[PDB]
Design a protein around this ligand. Sequence first.
Ligand SMILES: *[C@@H]1O[C@H](CO)[C@@H](O)[C@H](O)[C@H]1NC(C)=O
Ligand SMILES: *[C@@H]1O[C@H](CO)[C@@H](O)[C@H](O)[C@H]1NC(C)=O
Ligand SMILES: *[C@@H]1O[C@H](CO)[C@@H](O)[C@H](O)[C@H]1NC(C)=O
Ligand SMILES: *[C@@H]1O[C@H](CO)[C@@H](O)[C@H](O)[C@H]1NC(C)=O
Ligand SMILES: *[C@@H]1O[C@H](CO)[C@@H](O)[C@H](O)[C@H]1NC(C)=O
Ligand SMILES: *[C@@H]1O[C@H](CO)[C@@H](O)[C@H](O)[C@H]1NC(C)=O
Ligand SMILES: *[C@@H]1O[C@H](CO)[C@@H](O)[C@H](O)[C@H]1NC(C)=O
Ligand SMILES: *[C@@H]1O[C@H](CO)[C@@H](O)[C@H](O)[C@H]1NC(C)=O
Ligand SMILES: *[C@@H]1O[C@H](CO)[C@@H](O)[C@H](O)[C@H]1NC(C)=O
Ligand SMILES: *[C@@H]1O[C@H](CO)[C@@H](O)[C@H](O)[C@H]1NC(C)=O
Ligand SMILES: *[C@@H]1O[C@H](CO)[C@@H](O)[C@H](O)[C@H]1NC(C)=O
Ligand SMILES: *[C@@H]1O[C@H](CO)[C@@H](O)[C@H](O)[C@H]1NC(C)=O
Ligand SMILES: *[C@@H]1O[C@H](CO)[C@@H](O)[C@H](O)[C@H]1NC(C)=O
Ligand SMILES: *[C@@H]1O[C@H](CO)[C@@H](O)[C@H](O)[C@H]1NC(C)=O
Ligand SMILES: *[C@@H]1O[C@H](CO)[C@@H](O)[C@H](O)[C@H]1NC(C)=O
Ligand SMILES: *[C@@H]1O[C@H](CO)[C@@H](O)[C@H](O)[C@H]1NC(C)=O
Lengths: 1095, 195, 49, 49
Amino acid sequence: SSMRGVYYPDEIFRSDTLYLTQDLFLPFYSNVTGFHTINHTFGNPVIPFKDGIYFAATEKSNVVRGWVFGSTMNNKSQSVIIINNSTNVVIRACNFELCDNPFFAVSKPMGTQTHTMIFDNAFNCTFEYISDAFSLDVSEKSGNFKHLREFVFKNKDGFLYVYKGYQPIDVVRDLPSGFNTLKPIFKLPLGINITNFRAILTAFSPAQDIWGTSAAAYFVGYLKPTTFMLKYDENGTITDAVDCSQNPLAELKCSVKSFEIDKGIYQTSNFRVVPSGDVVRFPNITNLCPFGEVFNATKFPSVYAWERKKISNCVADYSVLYNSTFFSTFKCYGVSATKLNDLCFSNVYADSFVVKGDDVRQIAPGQTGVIADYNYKLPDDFMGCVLAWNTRNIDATSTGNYNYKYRYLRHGKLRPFERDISNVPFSPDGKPCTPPALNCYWPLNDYGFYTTTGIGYQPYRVVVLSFELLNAPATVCGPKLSTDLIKNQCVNFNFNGLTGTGVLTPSSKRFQPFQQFGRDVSDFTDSVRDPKTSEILDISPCSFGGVSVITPGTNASSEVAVLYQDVNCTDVSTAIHADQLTPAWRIYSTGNNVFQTQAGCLIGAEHVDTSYECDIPIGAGICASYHTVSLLRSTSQKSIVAYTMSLGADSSIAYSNNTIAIPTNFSISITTEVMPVSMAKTSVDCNMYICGDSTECANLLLQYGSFCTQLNRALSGIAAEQDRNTREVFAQVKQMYKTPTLKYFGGFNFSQILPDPLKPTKRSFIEDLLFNKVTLADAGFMKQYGECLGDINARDLICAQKFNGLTVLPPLLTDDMIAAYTAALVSGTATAGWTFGAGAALQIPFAMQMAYRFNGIGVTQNVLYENQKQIANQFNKAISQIQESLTTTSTALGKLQDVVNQNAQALNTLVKQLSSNFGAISSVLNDILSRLDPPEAEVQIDRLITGRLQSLQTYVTQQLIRAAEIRASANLAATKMSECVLGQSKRVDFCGKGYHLMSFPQAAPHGVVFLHVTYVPSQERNFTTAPAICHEGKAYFPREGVFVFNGTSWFITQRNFFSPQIITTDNTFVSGNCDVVIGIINNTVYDPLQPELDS
Amino acid sequence: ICAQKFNGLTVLPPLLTDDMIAAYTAALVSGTATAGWTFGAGAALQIPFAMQMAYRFNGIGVTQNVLYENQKQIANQFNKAISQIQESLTTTSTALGKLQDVVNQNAQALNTLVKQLSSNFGAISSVLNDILSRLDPPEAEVQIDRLITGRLQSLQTYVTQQLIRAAEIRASANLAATKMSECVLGQSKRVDFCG
Amino acid sequence: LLLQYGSFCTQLNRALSGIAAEQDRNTREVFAQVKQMYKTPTLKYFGGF
Amino acid sequence: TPSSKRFQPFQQFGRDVSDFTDSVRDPKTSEILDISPCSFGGVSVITPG
Ligand SMILES: *[C@@H]1O[C@H](CO)[C@@H](O)[C@H](O)[C@H]1NC(C)=O
Ligand SMILES: *[C@@H]1O[C@H](CO)[C@@H](O)[C@H](O)[C@H]1NC(C)=O
Ligand SMILES: *[C@@H]1O[C@H](CO)[C@@H](O)[C@H](O)[C@H]1NC(C)=O
Ligand SMILES: *[C@@H]1O[C@H](CO)[C@@H](O)[C@H](O)[C@H]1NC(C)=O
Ligand SMILES: *[C@@H]1O[C@H](CO)[C@@H](O)[C@H](O)[C@H]1NC(C)=O
Ligand SMILES: *[C@@H]1O[C@H](CO)[C@@H](O)[C@H](O)[C@H]1NC(C)=O
Ligand SMILES: *[C@@H]1O[C@H](CO)[C@@H](O)[C@H](O)[C@H]1NC(C)=O
Ligand SMILES: *[C@@H]1O[C@H](CO)[C@@H](O)[C@H](O)[C@H]1NC(C)=O
Ligand SMILES: *[C@@H]1O[C@H](CO)[C@@H](O)[C@H](O)[C@H]1NC(C)=O
Ligand SMILES: *[C@@H]1O[C@H](CO)[C@@H](O)[C@H](O)[C@H]1NC(C)=O
Ligand SMILES: *[C@@H]1O[C@H](CO)[C@@H](O)[C@H](O)[C@H]1NC(C)=O
Ligand SMILES: *[C@@H]1O[C@H](CO)[C@@H](O)[C@H](O)[C@H]1NC(C)=O
Ligand SMILES: *[C@@H]1O[C@H](CO)[C@@H](O)[C@H](O)[C@H]1NC(C)=O
Ligand SMILES: *[C@@H]1O[C@H](CO)[C@@H](O)[C@H](O)[C@H]1NC(C)=O
Ligand SMILES: *[C@@H]1O[C@H](CO)[C@@H](O)[C@H](O)[C@H]1NC(C)=O
Ligand SMILES: *[C@@H]1O[C@H](CO)[C@@H](O)[C@H](O)[C@H]1NC(C)=O
């Protein structure tokens, strides 16, 4: 059950793109419940709806005649019902009864069950709807069960969204894997709380007699919040999709925004081990609150004696007091007594006294009147609570205890707590209130009656307490639990309020008796004393690191291996140790065969002992590749392997005390070198980029001062310099030499590297390959497999960007002007050699110019003229192999392609940061200016302006760095132009490789390419040799070259090319005597004069 | 390197280990001792080391016989001067200043990025658990926005420093790779370029 | 809260990954210029040197 | 402007690759219009001394 159930996410849709989005999609390869349904295996069972469902059925005649959705679908509350009349869909919102197989199928008069609506039977029809032909569209296709009706139902924001598609079927009870996309049909506003549903067969048993047909098949699968990448075509159609959760390859190609991936290692996500448990530790129990005084005095205070306090820095036993069977009543006005058992506060205020049983009615926090107002009533502003217990048995007396008097009225004491406590004739609001004279009065009844009085009289001792809540330190709390300790696992933990997540370990970390926990050199905490055991624990973080995917090209294989960076494989997954296959959907996006490296834990690759060159790099000398490994596995004999890299081919120079190796033959070579020279010249209208023509944003921007001019000054410097770079590399020629008619000098064929006038455009044939094989921002093209041609996007628009305040500007020299400078340099080089790089250009025959370039590398001139046929044939062949190479693959042009790709990523990141929220209510200025008043809109806009302006400073700073990095390559290229092309550099490996003969420049987009011509000696003899020779009395030494032995005879030769010559007075010089030199051999030096004296 | 791998910061291994680097230096020296310049341009062609030296003497414009007639003095001065390099490198710490500086600058940048975690940025604390326990959410988010903006400005600062320092090391690596091809594989005549 | 600022924690990782890959390019371009691994000679002493 | 956007019967308007709005279905009578920004740019002044 897979690749079903994708729908167009909304109505805003658009052409030819990869769009990555989050929604309640059906995740790929989840198990759908197939209700295979047949006669006795039969019913319409109610099913939970959850977050929404993919639903499908094998169908034609609308056998699934409808659906019912709601909380209950039968009683009290409204329900949505959807029914196929024989033509059309019916919708109602009514609270239907549906006690059985649902057959309340009564319908309106105009085409009953056929056109006008059905299920009329209920009591709250707040919505009703008639469709057109939405049951005939099912009935259109040929034969029942030979088609699948396919739907998504999702409920959010008070809307039921309905999407559908309808497709052919071959198996009457299966759900095929064929990809198709559902269209939206409805966004029903009905607001119903759907949590359950059922399909409707409405007592049907179809005349489509496959089984007698109290039977069908239908399918339910739950939607889940998942990230899909959706691929649109040029008609705005979804054509493909990727569930980014499924496996590490799906995650990779979502992260890369592509459906195809090249061979490489890619970073995709962070691994971060979750905690297994929780550890809470607190000290030995101590500092119990002094409640025994307030609560457990043997005889309590009278109403007027009223013992009272406030208490702090203590642990409250209130859980016990609440758990106590004693108290006749207790009430909290504040937060519930059930939580005061464990809650924390800055302090408590507490007091105690007595009442005749009746007056407990008035004493509470939240309660006031002339009883409590004139002997104890507290302010109702604390977390106040009140408790009562038996005075009737203890501190009562049978007369009524005349010491435990009644409340002492004093109407004028309006203030809380003061609420006249006092034993005084004081009852009025303001009369003189001495002792007993006729001005003033005292209620003086007895409260404390004994337990044999009626249950009204029966008096209570009473306590009130009042907890105080502040941001200040909570000096009172209920008791707190300590857990078991959990060593050697990632856990949550808490000491005395030092909370974290980590791995707790036993430790050797000695520290002083007064110290509770250790910091480290970073000043993060790393060790703690256990408050109960006094164990010295050491804390380290739970394992985390980058996750990287190792892949061949997806072109070649969809197998992948995964590297968890830096971690020990012991911490990594509860795996199943197959090579090749990650059980990834369930197991850690990964889940299989394991290997350890210093880079971290490597999964799914096989370790191989045979070394190879490094294909995909990993670290610490480990590399990976896609390789044949076991012929027993059929084509899957190719798997990902990991190995220690080979440094190079092993070799053994046979060092000899008296042997020298000298070349007998040579090979000409042509080597490409590719260099970047300039970036895309860019500018940004910062006031449009920030504000989008919001006038109010344009006002607020001015407060920041120079920035919008400063950034444009900086980019104008970078932009001007791209023309300086391009000018300094190419404009080294003094004069524009005309390209000659004859393209062929002394057998050497230039016709592929000069322009051709007979066949426009006006570039060399090799420049046409080079201008083809590069991708601009998304215009142009290049691919490493060799499977691409023609621009991937609009060229005069680069791909997009020219509409967001961003702009890109033309170069000063057009590509035709660059191709005119290379045509000038090559035609000058072919007709005049080094001379135009010093004086004026001097004509010289190309064969002679080559002989003097051979002479420059220490190969004597005659070697060229005697071999000119071979040298021309090797040159002409090597030029043709450059065309074959550039035609085959663009992998040589990677440097020029990268200059574009970095600039594309720089602009696309700068554009994406426009959409970013930055802690405003919205990233859209029209929202902020419509939803709010100006004094709030200013703060919202200021957050956007600050975010956007910081985003521009980032981009221009990246471009300053990148421009400086490109300038270093423009200066190096300008140097190679002067030294390699205009001359013959002797700097080893500066121009080409081997001995340097000459070089030709060629134009390329954003760069230059050099074709270096070099001479490589390539076959060698191995000769006996001597440092000097002794003739008569004296050592003779070679003027140039080496003395070597031909097996027969001693000869002298140049050491770049074996050319054995007679040893003579001409090619040797004398020094010293025969004894001085080590290992001098004894042989004749010939004299050209002696036979002429003998004449 | 201190502890490092334990606050989101991490340091990764190089591809070539020091034991692989030390194989390439041994290959380059033993090529230079037995085949001279030849393995740069062609394949390695074996040559007796005294004759290789006589041709390198001819390259500076001193006639070959000045070597052969003095070979004992020249070998003694060579063996002597190599031993002084070993003695000097045994004795003094100051010679490798450029390489120790590369370590020190990275150590300072990371320890600055680390200290900025403890910085307050005008919030009520630099600890998220203080903010999340002392306040209700409408206040807590604004106090966290101060820390997030502070910490994110500190990362954008650090990455910009490393981008500049990486270009400064690259300009040294390109020069060093050039001294390899010109000074080791050959006999470059550029005055005071090689020694 | 960190999601609201968009790209930056991806962008910073791409920049550090670029610098990190280049350290192997620098180290390779200096040392890996030799064509073949020439085995070190048994004799350490040549013509007196 | 009038446009060649082929966009589907349920769709109302198009976003570009950067997801700014680029085209719309006229709600009073269903033409497919395409929207481009009003002209903007740098001004530069060219001068002798
Ligand atoms: C999903 O699993 C159930 C049993 O849990 C099975 O009956 C059903 O056929 C499976 N789905 C499919 C498409 O086969
Ligand atoms: C939705 O309906 C179910 C079933 O009666 C009920 O448990 C749930 O609390 C309801 N939720 C709402 C938001 O009404
Ligand atoms: C209410 O619940 C009973 C349960 O037996 C059911 O028969 C009845 O159809 C439901 N609906 C109404 C509106 O009574
Ligand atoms: C219809 O629905 C409302 C709640 O939406 C309920 O109060 C009312 O009693 C219902 N009426 C009948 C007759 O079922
Ligand atoms: C777009 O839809 C039309 C429908 O006739 C079809 O002809 C065409 O091939 C489709 N694709 C493209 C890329 O135009
Ligand atoms: C108190 O500390 C001692 C220290 O030895 C320990 O044994 C005991 O378990 C602790 N008791 C409580 C109640 O924490
Ligand atoms: C003592 O403690 C009990 C149990 O919590 C409490 O109900 C009672 O009121 C207190 N006072 C006396 C005098 O027992
Ligand atoms: C006392 O507290 C415990 C808490 O676990 C509870 O199980 C018990 O039922 C309580 N008893 C009374 C008398 O409140
Ligand atoms: C890549 O796939 C194409 C077909 O899509 C095929 O022609 C080509 O040979 C493949 N190349 C490799 C190296 O896998
Ligand atoms: C990794 O875990 C193993 C135990 O499975 C342990 O022996 C080893 O020391 C740990 N560390 C490393 C770096 O391998
Ligand atoms: C050099 O090698 C080439 C290889 O094609 C061969 O044709 C030629 O005869 C050789 N030249 C000499 C002078 O040995
Ligand atoms: C020069 O080389 C090109 C290579 O394609 C060839 O077409 C042309 O005929 C050659 N001309 C001569 C005169 O050899
Ligand atoms: C080359 O010649 C020498 C004598 O000078 C001989 O000893 C040696 O074995 C030969 N080497 C090869 C590679 O043929
Ligand atoms: C070089 O020696 C060979 C045999 O090794 C001999 O045939 C030849 O004549 C000698 N060369 C010359 C120029 O005489
Ligand atoms: C090396 O050559 C010298 C003369 O140049 C000689 O004295 C010595 O014996 C030779 N070494 C060997 C191993 O033959
Ligand atoms: C060898 O040396 C002697 C004495 O210097 C000299 O006569 C002789 O000519 C030399 N040998 C040859 C073959 O020239």
